[PDB]
Amino acid sequence: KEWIPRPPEKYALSGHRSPVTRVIFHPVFSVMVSASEDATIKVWDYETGDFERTLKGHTDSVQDISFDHSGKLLASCSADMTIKLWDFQGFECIRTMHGHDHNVSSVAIMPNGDHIVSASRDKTIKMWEVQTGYCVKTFTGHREWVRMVRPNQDGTLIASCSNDQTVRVWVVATKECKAELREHEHVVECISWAPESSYSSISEATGSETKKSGKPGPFLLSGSRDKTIKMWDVSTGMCLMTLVGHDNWVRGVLFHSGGKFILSCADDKTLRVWDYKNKRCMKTLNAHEHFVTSLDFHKTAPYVVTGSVDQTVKVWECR
Amino acid sequence: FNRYPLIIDPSGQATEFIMNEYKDRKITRTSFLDDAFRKNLESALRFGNPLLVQDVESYDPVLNPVLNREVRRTGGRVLITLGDQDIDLSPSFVIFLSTRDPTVEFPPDLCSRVTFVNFTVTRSSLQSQCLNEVLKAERPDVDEKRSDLLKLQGEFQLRLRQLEKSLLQALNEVKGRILDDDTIITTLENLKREAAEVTRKVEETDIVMQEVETVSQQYLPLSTACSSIYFTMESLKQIHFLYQYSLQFFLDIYHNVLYENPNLKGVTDHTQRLSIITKDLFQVAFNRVA
């Protein structure tokens, strides 16, 4: 679908007293959740832009938050060296999870809905159990601060980006770096994978040849401070195209729900919508007076949410 | 007001004025004819919400304790005995009564319990309304020019009052002497210089008002005639009870002779159009009234 943000805004929510770090969309409910650096997690109704409640269980600045497939549990990571699990029915912290030394950067829940991953400055990725809270296995091999980590769509493959210029893809069963990618000019910050709605669109947009199985293979995308966005092939490990034009460091990247366009945010105070199919759409949209931190795309609703350093969260219509 | 007001306005213009003033206070409109009037009354009393009740000619005697302020103070709360139940009377509660019949009679007890506020049509107000109406129809450029300037003068005069108030505000809050802190001098220079152009803006606006006024002097006799005709209309009830005419009836006659006048099809001279309008105004009024 041709959902595209427009320069006019709808609501500019400003309730945080500290810069916002990430924003997400609730899988089912009309709820938008924003995480900031004041150790508070705020809940908003993006349809009407009304502050709902806050979750102030964390100690230090909250870095990354994530939901599950059912939207029942909320996982949070912060600089207080802990992972907090939130029950979204009553909005209370039901399990505080320790270990994973020093500032924890990112956290995510695999679509299995049973295990949680996390990334921190301690140059490792830890996999946990939501039910119990014991770290069964730990991922090692990154030599620097691991910034941002995402799983796949079926809880088997995990990619992690770090300051060490390497984006390593890990496997649940074998716990080995199947593909190691060390080619970025400057620090990689944000990564995101490709939904099934876009696998077909990649084949003729890049000229890639199908393998014997015919399936194009898992796809990767990494955003780095070098002002370049590069999308990668997990199965092979080579580039297909590099997106250039961001004025400053990029902080968030993800695919359109229709899998046709590219939406990203960067430290250039603007949001850029880019087309990789034909390089036709290069819409640059001024989003905030200060650095833009993170963004998200609603799966079905024509709404996009952006978080910035200016203590303000904005929602744009999609047309 | 001390006693709760009762509003008499046949045209109803006072009704939305009460609404607009108390719109921020979530004022609620009800009527005595509504069977659920009691529930709205208790909700307003308990939560202190402004209430406007229409059709006072069907006045419910249940308001007698409310209008008389027969309150009971005990335990720190204010208690009012509405019917047979006690309700905590919030101090922010206020009630307004309105009606559209200027000739409705009231029992003396009701007259004592309320403060009558009569919204009658005056000769000066009617002349201004008709003069503005003909100006819009005949000289729309002048009418919009006058409308913009009135807005300009209002916020010019408001600005001067704020500047004058702030200048006294700054001079009364200096902890010591004026020259001790340079920022004080900056404020006074800004405040004094701010009124410099506003005074000139007022002056340049005033001279255009002189031109606007001097072109509306031609339509003054028509507005004066309109006031005489309408007050003749109202006084027609002295000779027969059937000759009841409202202000809206005269406005429709005035509107018809201005926009729906067949004699203004090809006439472009302002003096000729004004004469035609004046001649047809008397003819149209007589045709409709008789």
């Binding site: - | 006693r3 419910d60 005697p61 309150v71 019917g83 007890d109 007259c111 319990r113």
Partner: protein, 291 residues
């Protein structure tokens, strides 16, 4: 009742008159005067002093004869069976039908309504009169003598206060529609507040304000409105006299307006209370802002 009251000479005389009747058996009041003159408030104040329980019917738009009868049944049961001192205060605006006066006419004179209690309610009333008579120690069994005790109790206990405006034609009409109202009721003509009463209210209420002018010059021709105004009046006394004159100006205004044929609204003492209250607030506000 948390409402301020200004006391003058007429109030003291009036409350004494009300207190006199309330201490008498089968004492009924007929208070006549302009609305808002304090007839209800004075009766309620006196009723509390003598232990009477004030009862007023909560009339509304849908009020009907059956509703009036039900209220009468409740009052009589409390007055007769429960031996409770009740001051039944009713305003003439509560009379929405001629049947309201018909019930009152029998109740005022006889002390009981023959047709009020029938069927199950009569049995319930008869039962309630049984243990009712037990508490005073009277052993009465049959229905007939029980009713006599109930009738006697109502006469001793129930007191009725009827207040209405001084309408000349209405007074003559009510003289025939309710003969018991003019025979079983003591008529007190409160009327409108006199010139002295208006002066006393103004003098007391405006005492808080300064109203002092040492260099005030007394004019040769003083527009004397209050007859007992001191011959060398002070600035405060002149102000209060002006306040009285303002109220009397409206009375002449309505008379001239009514004579010509216009619609007039009656001027009540509550208008005077608003006048002085506005005077007190405006004087305080203007003095504060000027300083």
């Amino acid at each position: 009742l948390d409402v301020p009251l200004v006391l003058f000479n007429e109030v003291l005389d009036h409350v004494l008159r009300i207190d006199r009747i309330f201490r008498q058996p089968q004492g009924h009041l007929l208070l006549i005067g302009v609305s808002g003159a304090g007839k209800t408030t004075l009766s309620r104040f006196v009723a509390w002093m003598n232990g009477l329980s004030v009862y007023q019917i909560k009339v509304h738009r849908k009020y009907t004869g059956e509703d009036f009868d039900e209220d009468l049944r409740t009052v009589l049961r409390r007055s007769g069976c429960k031996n409770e001192k009740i001051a039944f205060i009713m305003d003439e605006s509560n009379v929405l039908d001629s049947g309201f006066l018909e019930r009152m006419n029998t109740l005022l004179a006889n002390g009981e309504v023959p047709g009020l209690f029938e069927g199950d309610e009569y049995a319930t009333l008869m039962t309630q009169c049984k243990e009712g008579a037990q508490k005073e120690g009277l052993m009465l069994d049959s229905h007939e003598e029980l009713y006599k005790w109930f009738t006697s109790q109502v006469i001793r206990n129930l007191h009725v206060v009827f207040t209405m405006n001084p309408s000349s034609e209405g007074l003559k009409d009510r003289a025939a529609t309710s003969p018991a109202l003019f025979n079983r009721c003591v008529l007190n003509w409160f009327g409108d507040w006199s010139t002295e009463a208006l002066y006393q209210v103004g003098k007391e209420f405006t005492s808080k304000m300064d109203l002092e002018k040492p260099n005030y010059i007394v004019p040769d021709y003083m527009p004397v409105v209050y007859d007992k105004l001191p011959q060398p009046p002070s600035h405060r006394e002149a102000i209060v006299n002006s306040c009285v004159f303002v109220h009397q100006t409206l009375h002449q205004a309505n008379a001239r307006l009514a004579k010509r044929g216009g619609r007039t609204m009656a001027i009540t003492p509550r208008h005077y209370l608003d006048f002085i209250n506005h005077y007190a607030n405006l004087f305080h506000e203007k003095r504060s802002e000027l300083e």
